Amino acid sequence: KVFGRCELAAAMKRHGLDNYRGYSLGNWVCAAKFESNFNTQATNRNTDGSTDYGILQINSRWWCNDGRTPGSRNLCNIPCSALLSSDITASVNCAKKIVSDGNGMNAWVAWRNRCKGTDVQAWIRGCRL
Ligand SMILES: [Cl-]
């Protein structure tokens, strides 16, 4: 499913992401925009053989099992396919584990390069939240 900006902001707020570990909702909407263009079915293969899945492009080396990433961990304990659902619960739950992990949102290369230090509140402007 391809989300609208405000529809995603409301779903993320509902699943407890607004100010999770100190990151305002705008940060998570911005990351989702530049990771997946709001498309839950986005996948992208990396040079190392890992794949990134879903709205937040969570990576198979560490976080989910896709059966094709040799010697990967599955720290979120989910098949990577569960990250591609129109329901974002699995992505949200796994994102909360990633961002607690020590590097915060810098784990998302698009957030670091495109969102970090920007007026991220613009991402939720106009939305009924
Ligand atoms: Cl942090």
Description:
This is Lysozyme C. One of its GO terms (molecular function) is lysozyme activity. The chain has helices at about 5-15, 25-35, 90-100, 110-115, and strands at about 45, 50-55, 60. With about 130 residues, it is mainly alpha-helical. It has one domain (about 1-129): Lysozyme (Orthogonal Bundle), CATH 1.10.530.10. The protein has a three-stranded antiparallel β-sheet. A hairpin with a 5-residue loop joins β1 (about 45) and β2. α1 packs across α2. The longest helix has 12 residues, at about 25-35. Chloride ion (CL) binds near residues 21, 22 and 104.
Task: List descriptors.
129 residues, mainly alpha, Lysozyme, 3-stranded antiparallel beta sheet, 6% strand, binds chloride ion, allergen, bacteriolytic enzyme, identical protein binding, beta-N-acetylglucosaminidase activity
Query: How many helices does DSSP assign?
Result: 4
**Do you know the CATH topology?**
Lysozyme
Strand order of the largest sheet: 1-2-3
**Count of the separate structural domains:** 1
Strand percent estimate: 5-15%
Main sheet record: 3 strands, antiparallel
* Percentage of residues assigned to helices: 25-40%
Chemical compounds bound to the protein: chloride ion
For the termini, the CA-CA separation is 21 Å
CATH class: Mainly Alpha
Radius of gyration: 14 Å
Function: Lysozymes have primarily a bacteriolytic function; those in tissues and body fluids are associated with the monocyte-macrophage system and enhance the activity of immunoagents. Has bacteriolytic activity against M.luteus.
Subunit structure: Monomer.
Subcellular location: Secreted
Binding site for substrate: 101
